[PDB]
């Protein structure tokens, strides 16, 4: 019940036809071109594969998700952020952020081809990054693909205590304050779960997707700017 993607066509098979185990395995092949990738997110699909393997496309059931408002924040994190040593920006250094993610340990799945593919979406205005700075040094951040009022988180990275939590916390506030509705996490992991991510039915997620992709945030919401300083 899988499928080999057409090298000339950008079409995808329906997500409900994906495998149960591995969860969401939907197709393989094709390419990571701007249009293809973009099409995959509109349909609740995303590429995920290790170096050496051919492109693998997924749409898991259930789906990992994070309600911005339901973001969990311990009391020591609140004390920390009130006196934060960090500065947070948006779309200041997409290239550095994704490279920071691809440099962790699964950062090994963020292959050169993947870095190049998402960089294209960034240049084209679809992928965005949140940077966390400690003085002059980039110490964390995250990036994803905007889909209207729905944001699909791709990865995060941390080089200093609470750096990635500061990226998400600040991002959520900004996002919530301007109409953001949901953050897609694809698959629930340990870190993502401690932040408040939960699981909902694949069709529920696809319903939200179709509804939120039409939604709109302020026209200049993603222009590069400082989001948190003093």
């Amino acid at each position: 019940r899988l499928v080999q993607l057409s090298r000339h066509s950008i079409a995808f098979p329906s997500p409900e036809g994906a495998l149960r185990e591995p969860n969401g395995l939907l197709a393989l092949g094709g390419d990571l071109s701007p249009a293809r990738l973009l099409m995959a997110y509109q349909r609740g699909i995303f590429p995920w594969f290790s170096p050496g393997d051919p492109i693998l496309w997924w749409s898991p059931d259930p789906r990992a998700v994070l309600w911005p408002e339901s973001l969990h924040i311990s009391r020591s994190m609140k004390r920390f952020h009130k006196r934060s040593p960090y500065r947070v920006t948006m779309n200041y250094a997409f290239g550095q952020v994704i490279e920071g993610c691809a440099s962790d340990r699964e950062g090994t799945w963020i292959t050169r081809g993947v870095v190049e593919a998402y960089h294209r979406l960034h240049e084209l205005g679809h992928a965005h990054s949140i940077e966390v700075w400690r003085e002059d040094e980039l110490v964390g951040g995250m990036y994803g693909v905007a889909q209207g009022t729905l944001f699909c988180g791709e990865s995060m990275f941390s080089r200093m205590e609470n750096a990635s939590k500061t990226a998400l916390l600040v991002f959520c506030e900004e996002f919530i304050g301007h109409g953001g509705k949901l953050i897609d996490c694809q698959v629930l992991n340990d870190h993502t779960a401690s932040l408040g991510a939960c699981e909902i039915p694949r069709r529920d997620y696809l319903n939200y997707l179709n509804q939120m992709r039409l939604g709109r945030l302020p026209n200049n919401f993603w222009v590069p700017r400082c989001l948190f300083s003093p």
């Binding site: 995303f46 995920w48 990992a64 993610c101 699964e106 950062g107 799945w109 963020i110 995250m142 994803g144 988180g153 791709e154 990865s155 995060m156 996490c185 694809q186 698959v187 992991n189 340990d190 870190h191 993502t192």
Partner: peptide, 5 residues
């Protein structure tokens, strides 16, 4: 964020 597990 899938690239965290």
């Amino acid at each position: 964020f899938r690239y965290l597990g």
